Design a protein around this ligand. Structure first.
Ligand SMILES: O=c1[nH]cnc2cnccc12
Ligand SMILES: [Zn+2]
Ligand SMILES: [Zn+2]
Length: 350
């Protein structure tokens, strides 16, 4: 496991239509390749696959709570205050996105736009049409349908009947230039899938899960007051740390640009942050494999109740780890997670 992807670099995959039909099996395959080590992987779907005929019929879709993204800070360290604005349509949002005030600046290469984002992120706050409940997939699409992934995370809805927005349901993100997401891991340290439906690119930064604690120690040192108030303040999704800051403090990280028509997979305990190049739309949700159960059992949650997502691990432990159930309920489960190990389902490829 330590031999595959030794630098824990972001990997890209090009499945065929046959390989694209079994979602869970393909995630097992990419892990057998060492993809998970980076904490982020890109999946380019087969040319024949399309989740919708066109996007010219969504102008009247309402973004109920758009957020103005105010950033405070300096020297590569920032706090993001996401201000709720009144509801707007996709057409109203696209008009603001493409206006002279908010449009993407003229640039040659990504590195120019990236330098531009870190120089100007505290000025002219943009509007992010983020966390919109909904899907852009046509009803008949069976392959990589974010609405219905059919992973083991489905036990939460199957056994209890409870739905957690964006976690076991899809979220839509309407972006504009300079909109962004703060460093974070998923709720319960779950996996996530992100499909960029259309528009301008979305740039990502990732820290390998095996270096995740180094990012946490850096954050705690910089924000001691926040660290004193909450056990996992990064779950508030307010902390921005520049790649230059990470480089200076020796935090290993990688960066990738996602283009329209591509999927991004985040792995358990894979910290990620990023920004939108301009007007776009992405669909997202969380999912699980057998490997996540131990991450969910060990996840450190927000203790100040600013973040409320908590999944009971009991059903997963009883069903997939019965030999460990009594030891775990007694608080005697001393399992140490090896972040390099692929999911057990990967066995057929190894
Ligand atoms: O594209 C994103 N927008 C907002 N939040 C996110 C969280 N994780 C991944 C991607 C995004
Ligand atoms: Zn995320
Ligand atoms: Zn908290």
């Amino acid at each position: 496991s330590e031999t595959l992807n030794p630098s824990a670099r972001i990997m890209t995959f090009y499945p065929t239509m046959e390989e694209f039909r079994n979602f869970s099996r393909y995630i097992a395959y990419i892990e057998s390749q060492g993809a998970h080590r980076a904490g982020l992987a890109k999946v380019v779907p087969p040319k024949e696959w399309k989740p919708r005929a066109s996007y010219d019929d969504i102008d009247d879709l309402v973004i109920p709570a758009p957020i103005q993204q105010l950033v405070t800070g300096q020297s590569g360290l920032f706090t993001q205050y996401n201000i709720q604005k009144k509801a707007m349509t996709v057409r109203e949002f696209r008009k603001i996105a493409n206006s002279d005030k908010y449009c993407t600046p003229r640039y040659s290469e990504f590195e120019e736009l990236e330098r531009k984002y870190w120089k100007n992120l505290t000025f002219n706050p943009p509007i992010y049409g983020a966390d919109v409940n909904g899907t852009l997939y046509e009803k008949h699409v069976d392959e990589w349908n974010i609405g219905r992934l059919r992973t083991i995370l489905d036990l939460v809805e199957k056994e209890s009947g409870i739905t957690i927005e964006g976690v076991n349901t899809p979220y839509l993100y309407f972006g504009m230039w300079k909109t962004s997401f703060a460093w974070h891991t998923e709720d319960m340290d779950l996996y996530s899938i992100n499909y960029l439906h259309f528009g301008e690119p979305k740039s990502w930064y990732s820290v390998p899960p095996e270096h995740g604690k180094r990012l946490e120690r850096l954050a705690k040192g910089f924000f001691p007051g926040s660290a004193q108030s909450c056990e996992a303040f990064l779950r508030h999704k307010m902390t921005l740390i520049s790649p230059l800051m990470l480089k200076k403090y020796g935090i290993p990280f990688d960066k990738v640009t996602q283009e329209a028509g591509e999927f991004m997979i985040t792995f358990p305990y894979g910290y990620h942050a990023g920004f939108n190049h301009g007007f776009n739309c992405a669909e997202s949700t969380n999912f699980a494999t057998r490997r996540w159960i131990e991450y969910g059992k060990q996840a450190v949650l927000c203790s100040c109740r600013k973040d409320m997502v908590k999944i009971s691990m009991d059903v997963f432990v009883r069903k997939f780890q019965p030999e460990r159930y009594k030891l775990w309920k007694a608080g005697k489960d001393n399992t140490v997670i090896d972040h390099t190990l692929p999911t057990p389902e990967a066995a057929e490829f190894l």
